[PDB]
Amino acid sequence: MRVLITGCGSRGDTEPLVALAARLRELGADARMCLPPDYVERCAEVGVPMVPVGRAVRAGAREPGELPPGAAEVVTEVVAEWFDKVPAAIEGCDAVVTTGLLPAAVAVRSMAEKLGIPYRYTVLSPDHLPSEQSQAERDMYNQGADRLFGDAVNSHRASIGLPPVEHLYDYGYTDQPWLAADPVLSPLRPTDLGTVQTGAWILPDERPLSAELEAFLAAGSTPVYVGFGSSSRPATADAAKMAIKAVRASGRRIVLSRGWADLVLPDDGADCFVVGEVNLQELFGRVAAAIHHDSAGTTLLAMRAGIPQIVVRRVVDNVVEQAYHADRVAELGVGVAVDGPVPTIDSLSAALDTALAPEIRARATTVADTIRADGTTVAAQLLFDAVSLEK
């Protein structure tokens, strides 16, 4: 069995795919990948063959003026790019697993269709499952897409043999997209019954922390973590500042992450430490708690890490949009959710004080063991079944 894994999005959209591919070849299967140039180092790092496709997702890795790949402006160029590079890679494959940017998702499904190999699209959060969308929301998306790239797709489609297609939202996401997320954190809801949930796809990180970090994590008190992953909004920097301040008001050390926003410490202070690529799994098991963005991957890792959390709501929790993970952590009682984009120092100091309180420093250590550690395996077996049946 050989599987192709496609994707185009933030790192939270990619790490899960890299985990699946790592797990597949670990089980004997073979896995190739198609991702933006951003993840070449990471892939080579994990030992998973990968083909660089399209533009870079992170601004700091592109020309000052080349818009992001998700930018409508350049969508046609996208559809075109994939249909061009995927071939060499999808050839010899038995199944395709993809996620992220719909344009490319569709382009990929197409090529899997020409080969006759099964295709699967996965979402990382329940609220993205079309079953959680309003029958209205559906058509809107469909139209939008059908409008934005509906042609460039069919062109290349007709260019290899297959006929046209419409409602690309339903096409690229499929009638039953997968939910690669853990049950405790991201539970399903009636609207989504026969929906496959495998648990999150996590790659057991074995990378050791640098000698420096190890030193710091020895030259003092057990620190709090501050990071915002792929977050690159300008507020990100302000948020980090306030967080650093709040944690310092608590009288605790800090371990900050540069992330995609390229943050930096503000003092030569010995109570802080900035890190680039680090083994979060490893680090989370060596900090007091973690302050971070409303994201899938980080929230779960800190949950299986067993440490409390402070999640920054992207905006005010309104009737038309709520911070899923942030709220989820609150509802589970493993952390505090603070409103943003730039939370007050008071809110964070309070949130921090609540979090490191027995009640939470316990619900967290306990919930940590209810987390599924076999998501990648479940997806792999589900893949094995697909290939055997429909092919």
Add this chain to the structure above:
Amino acid sequence: XXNXXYX
């Protein structure tokens, strides 16, 4: 307006 992300 019809394609995804996240960025």
